[PDB]
């Protein structure tokens, strides 16, 4: 249950952090 | 999982505005740039210039080690010379031939998009020569690369010459002749 | 810099209760330890056992994947089959030889310390053994390594033998039996 | 100058973290 909630906010800020960069610096516009 | 393969850079226009999706393809490393806050590595199929631009993301000290490391890997592994600070290689297969199988994971929002790198298996030159001649999409995509690398040899404009190949193996120069005939 | 070189593991008896200081050492890897967590690294100079563990940091999945990508090109470079989780590899010696060119941060506090990787070359066991044939601190430590392998496979109970090596070179039987002689 | 505040800034907490890391879980113990 530990190793779980865990896992689940890694993923969690992740998930944040890739779609926030690519938001202010994507590496392919349109 | 699911991780859907990509055989060219185009396939991108029918993914999600805003989506995050696992990928792979297969492709030869051509340019490297690493700099203290980003790294990008430039792959290309040849379809003649850089296709696949991977992003290694890294904020703190400690991800950019092992963005470093990562990068001196890879580096030794093709026989790359790295001095070891912004550092810059560019078109890589005029003077090596790195094929690689990479998995990456596709990011996009407002429709623009960034492929972050989750994996990078460097494949040797002797079993990509290998694979080909004793004989799937990793094999259609290894075929096609080294189909449009024989085209950009033929062509005399093009800076492309197996012979300049710091590696150009006796065996290099047999699968290459040999190669020639299926066209 | 000022990047002090460690002969030794005992070295650190010597180093600071509290202070960062960026060492170097050459050693064989010999053991994996590969968490979602963290990761340590294993080596041994074999003056027989583990002696260096170092350590690869590293809190979100942003770095985890660094650590992974890491992890998987040293394990290629060397030829040592990965399932890519927990993973753990133990006495890879016993089955393969991987020389190391390691640079490390020494990091303590109250006395307790922790070597955080910087940076590792791996060394081809070709030019190894060149290099000691033909033929500072590196070769020092190469010399010794190779010495200490030597006597432990003179050993009868030792479970290290060169013959069981996957990579047991008709080179290797050369260079061992040509090196016996200097004994 | 810019480039300079975030490497400072970066190496600052680098060296905490690492420090703190000792702390908590050394690999080492006396």
């Known amino acids: ?9 890694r993923y969690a800020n992740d998930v944040q ?5 690519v938001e202010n610096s994507p590496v392919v516009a349109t | 999982k699911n991780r859907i393969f990509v055989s060219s850079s185009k396939d991108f226009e029918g993914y999600p505005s805003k989506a995050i999706v ?11 740039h690493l700099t203290e806050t980003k790294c990008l590595l430039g792959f290309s199929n040849f379809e003649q210039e850089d296709q696949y631009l991977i992003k290694l993301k890294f904020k703190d ?7 470093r490391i990562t990068i001196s890997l890879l580096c030794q592994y093709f026989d790359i010379e790295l001095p070891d600070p912004t550092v810059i290689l560019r078109d890589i297969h005029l003077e090596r031939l790195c094929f690689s199988s990479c998995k ?6 407002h429709g623009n998009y960034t492929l972050f790198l ?10 990509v020569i290998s694979t080909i001649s004793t004989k799937c999409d990793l094999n259609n995509s290894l075929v096609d690369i080294f189909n449009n690398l024989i085209e950009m040899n ?9 012979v300049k190949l710091i590696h150009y193996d006796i065996e290099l120069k047999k699968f290459v002749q040999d190669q020639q005939k299926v066209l």
């Open chain 2, 154 to 162: 033929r062509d005399e404009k093009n800076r492309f010459k197996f």
């Open chain 2, 104 to 109: 990456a994971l596709y990011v996009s929002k």
């Open chain 2, 118 to 127: 989750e994996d990078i298996k460097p494949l040797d030159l002797v079993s």
């Open chain 1, 17 to 21: 952090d890739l779609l926030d960069d």
């Open chain 2, 61 to 67: 000290r400690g991800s950019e080690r092992l963005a």
């Open chain 2, 22 to 32: 696992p990928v792979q393809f297969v492709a030869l490393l051509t340019s490297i």
């Open chain 1, 1 to 9: 249950p530990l190793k779980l909630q865990s896992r689940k906010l």
